[PDB]
Amino acid sequence: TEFLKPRLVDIEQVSSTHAKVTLEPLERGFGHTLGNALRRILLSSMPGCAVTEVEIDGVLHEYSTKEGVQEDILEILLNLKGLAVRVQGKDEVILTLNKSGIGPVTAADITHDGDVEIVKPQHVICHLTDENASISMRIKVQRGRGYVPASTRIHLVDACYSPVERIAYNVEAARVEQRTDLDKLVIEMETNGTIDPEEAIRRAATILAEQLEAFV
Amino acid sequence: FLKPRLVDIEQVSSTHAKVTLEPLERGFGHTLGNALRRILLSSMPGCAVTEVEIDGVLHEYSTKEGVQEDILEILLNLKGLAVRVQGKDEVILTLNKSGIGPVTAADITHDGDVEIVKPQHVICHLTDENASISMRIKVQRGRGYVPASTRIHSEEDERPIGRLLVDACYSPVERIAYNVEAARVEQRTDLDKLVIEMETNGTIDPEEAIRRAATILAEQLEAFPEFDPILLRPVDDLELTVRSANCLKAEAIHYIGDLVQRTEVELLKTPNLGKKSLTEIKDVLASRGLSLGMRLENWPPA
Amino acid sequence: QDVVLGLYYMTRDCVNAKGEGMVLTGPKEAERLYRSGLASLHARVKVRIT
Amino acid sequence: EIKELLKLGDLPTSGQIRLYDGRTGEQFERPVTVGYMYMLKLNHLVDDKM
Amino acid sequence: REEAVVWDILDEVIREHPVLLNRAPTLHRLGIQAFEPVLIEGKAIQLHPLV
């Protein structure tokens, strides 16, 4: 009463931050359990650090207007949420936005630290309008083993930890020789660019394997 | 990154039990739980009865004199018989009984690996004083649902027409349900519990099932033209006499290719082949455009 | 029929729900908010779209 | 009388309960009607018609 | 004999070869529509919902 392992595996990836991997032969009903358990883990639980909270230099609140920037503070906060941060052994690091001028503040306009790595220099934080337009602020990162929104911090920025932006699994019929119907499991993911989707899947399901380490 | 493990396993009955898992992180009770439910329901070892040869019965659509049950009913009853074996993948049992009264599952002869979980289980009743039924109940082990209809492809002489094939019900699991309640361990922010309450026929232990389930689940993570076709036909396709076939097989001649290489000399030197047999072989070979002493040079390719 | 009831139940709003009034960078994390059970499928929300 | 016989059965008046997808394990939004319907198999069986 | 190979051969001949589907009360020309065959285990014809 031996079992079935998948023998045709192909990863067709678009660009870099996006990937569509497919697995041909899966026993009946294994495609849904695999696809789903991995989707749940991928989305709801993943290591990563982005932005938890950022202090406001001009005002004390998320609702206000900065001299030199037409973007609302919340808007800039969303932009900050879209910032890719990969840190080293340092658990919580803080950066600074020191810059001024007649043009937009990019992710390359942030302060460079030792353990901090920003994957996207073209990333837009906010614009800078005419003249000097005084602007600079301190940005604090944090870790999570899942997705924790700003409202969830009860005792503000939405903290997007899991690198996954989008996860979907499509299960279709798999034909192998004289075996009637099998599952074909297609996992399609989009990430924030910090960790590539390929390894991301591995480490994701690896958490699953760690969870089962006390049974098999 | 705390990994879960098991805790008290509460057996409320021979039928079903509730297995529990303590150290579960945020939301993992569901992710682990449902996935565990899936494998639990789907893939599990089972021993369900397959083949049954009864006394005077040619087909499942007859009625045996002395039993109020139709034969098909008796097969359907047998399919619901729960047994567990240890060292044997397939065992055959023998059922025997007579006189007026119900024939239960405890009326079978007990074997080494045979364990009857429901001795009270009713196979069929007996209506007359002198009326007796004997049967061979061939019980093999497998996974999933294997109907009787797909069972015949291989075929290979199931000729004992008295043998009625029955649909394979292989699976210990009846009902599986998983509930996550918040589980407070002494010191920890917030953790969850996993109460998997399962239903079985008693033929599988809860710890065993819960073990193999996650065993398989993790196990999936392991990845994330010349010559005549007629020369390779078995000698039985020549449709020789039983004697000639057995003699040839005894001389290491299992296929037509092996036979056409041999000469009359060599065949007559065998301990069991007379002139009649050789005449027969030459006749059947000539009838299909073949003969003895045929050379094909290159025996065999792969 | 089924499909249009699907898009109807999807695209629709109630008065109050999970994540009511919050803001998100785009559809990606909108769906990411929904699938994690944090945000209700139908809730009044401002999002940046292109 | 039906609801009154549902009370005696420990089951809700609505006749609707919570159901969970056997795939994702997650709950279905809104209660669904579950019950016991008597269903017949007419003889149009496909292996005849085909 | 339905030898195991022939199935694969069938998969070859089916690929780019369309088939015609038709229903009983044919009125407008859409009453008959061509599709691309997908091999199915069963005796029933699977028809796209939008059609």
UniProtKB/Swiss-Prot annotation, chain A:
Keyword Transferase: yes
GO CC terms, sorted: cytoplasm; cytosol; cytosolic DNA-directed RNA polymerase complex; membrane; transcription elongation factor complex
The record's account of how the chain is modified after translation: (Microbial infection) ADP-ribosylated on both alpha subunits by the phage T4 protein ModA. ADP-ribosylated on only one of the alpha subunits by the phage T4 protein Alt.
Any GO molecular function: DNA-directed RNA polymerase activity
Reported effect, residue 175 to C: In rpoA101; temperature-sensitive
Coiled-coil residue windows: none
Domain of life: Bacteria
Cell cycle as UniProt keyword: no
Enzyme Commission number(s) from the entry: 2.7.7.6
Keyword entries, A-Z: Acetylation, ADP-ribosylation, DNA-directed RNA polymerase, Nucleotidyltransferase, Transcription, Transferase
Any one Gene Ontology BP term: cell motility
Region of interest: Alpha N-terminal domain (alpha-NTD): 1-216
Reaction it catalyzes: RNA(n) + a ribonucleoside 5'-triphosphate = RNA(n+1) + diphosphate
Top EC class, one word: transferase
Similarity annotation: Belongs to the RNA polymerase alpha chain family.
Comment text on domains: The N-terminal domain is essential for RNAP assembly and basal transcription, whereas the C-terminal domain is involved in interaction with transcriptional regulators (such as CRP) and with upstream promoter elements.
Protein name as annotated: DNA-directed RNA polymerase subunit alpha
Protein's gene: rpoA
UniProtKB/Swiss-Prot annotation, chain B:
Modified residues (N6-acetyllysine): 275-276
Domain of life, per lineage: Bacteria
Region (Required for interaction with Crp at class II promoters): 155-158
Top-tier EC class: transferase
InterPro entries: DNA-dir_RNA_pol_insert, DNA-dir_RNA_pol_RpoA/D/Rpb3, DNA-dir_RpoA, RBP11-like, RNAP_asu_C, RNApol_insert_sf
Substitution effect: residue 38 to C: In rpoA112; temperature-sensitive, blocks RNA polymerase assembly
GO molecular function: DNA binding; DNA-directed RNA polymerase activity; protein dimerization activity
Region (Alpha C-terminal domain (alpha-CTD)): 227-302
Metal-binding in keyword set: no
Described purpose of this protein according to its UniProt entry: DNA-dependent RNA polymerase (RNAP) catalyzes the transcription of DNA into RNA using the four ribonucleoside triphosphates as substrates. This subunit plays an important role in subunit assembly since its dimerization is the first step in the sequential assembly of subunits to form the holoenzyme. Part of the processive rRNA transcription and antitermination complex (rrnTAC). The complex forms an RNA-chaperone ring around the RNA exit tunnel of RNAP. It supports rapid transcription and antitermination of rRNA operons, cotranscriptional rRNA folding, and annealing of distal rRNA regions to allow correct ribosome biogenesis.
Annotated family: Belongs to the RNA polymerase alpha chain family.
Domain notes: The N-terminal domain is essential for RNAP assembly and basal transcription, whereas the C-terminal domain is involved in interaction with transcriptional regulators (such as CRP) and with upstream promoter elements.
Protein name in UniProt: DNA-directed RNA polymerase subunit alpha
UniProtKB/Swiss-Prot annotation, chain C:
Biotech utility: Co-administration of salinamide and rifampicin or salinamide and myxopyronin suppresses the emergence of resistance to both antibiotics.
Post-translational changes noted in the entry: Acetylated on several lysine residues in the presence of glucose.
Subunit structure: The RNAP catalytic core consists of 2 alpha, 1 beta, 1 beta' and 1 omega subunit. When a sigma factor is associated with the core the holoenzyme is formed, which can initiate transcription. The rRNA transcription and antitermination complex (rrnTAC) consists of RNAP, NusA, NusB, NusE (rpsJ), NusG, SubB, ribosomal protein S4, DNA and precursor rRNA; S4 is more flexible than other subunits.
Entry similarity comment: Belongs to the RNA polymerase beta' chain family.
Biological role stated in the UniProt entry: DNA-dependent RNA polymerase (RNAP) catalyzes the transcription of DNA into RNA using the four ribonucleoside triphosphates as substrates. Resistance to the antibiotics salinamide A, salinamide B, rifampicin, streptolydigin, CBR703, myxopyronin, and lipiarmycin can result from mutations in this protein.
The protein's name: DNA-directed RNA polymerase subunit beta'
Source organism of the structure: Escherichia coli (strain K12)
Gene name, Swiss-Prot/TrEMBL: rpoC
Full protein: residues contained: 504 to 553 of 1407
From Swiss-Prot, chain D:
Protein origin, superkingdom: Bacteria
Chain positions found as N6-acetyllysine: 7
Biotechnological relevance of this protein: Co-administration of salinamide and rifampicin or salinamide and myxopyronin suppresses the emergence of resistance to both antibiotics.
Post-translational modification (record): Acetylated on several lysine residues in the presence of glucose.
Membership in a protein family: Belongs to the RNA polymerase beta chain family.
Quaternary structure and interacting proteins, as annotated: The RNAP catalytic core consists of 2 alpha, 1 beta, 1 beta' and 1 omega subunit. When a sigma factor is associated with the core the holoenzyme is formed, which can initiate transcription. The rRNA transcription and antitermination complex (rrnTAC) consists of RNAP, NusA, NusB, NusE (rpsJ), NusG, SubB, ribosomal protein S4, DNA and precursor rRNA; S4 is more flexible than other subunits. In pull-down experiments interacts with CedA. (Microbial infection) Interacts (via flap domain) with Escherichia phage lambda antitermination protein Q; this interaction renders bacterial RNAP resistant to transcription pausing and allows it to read through termination signals.
Function summary: DNA-dependent RNA polymerase (RNAP) catalyzes the transcription of DNA into RNA using the four ribonucleoside triphosphates as substrates.
Protein name: DNA-directed RNA polymerase subunit beta
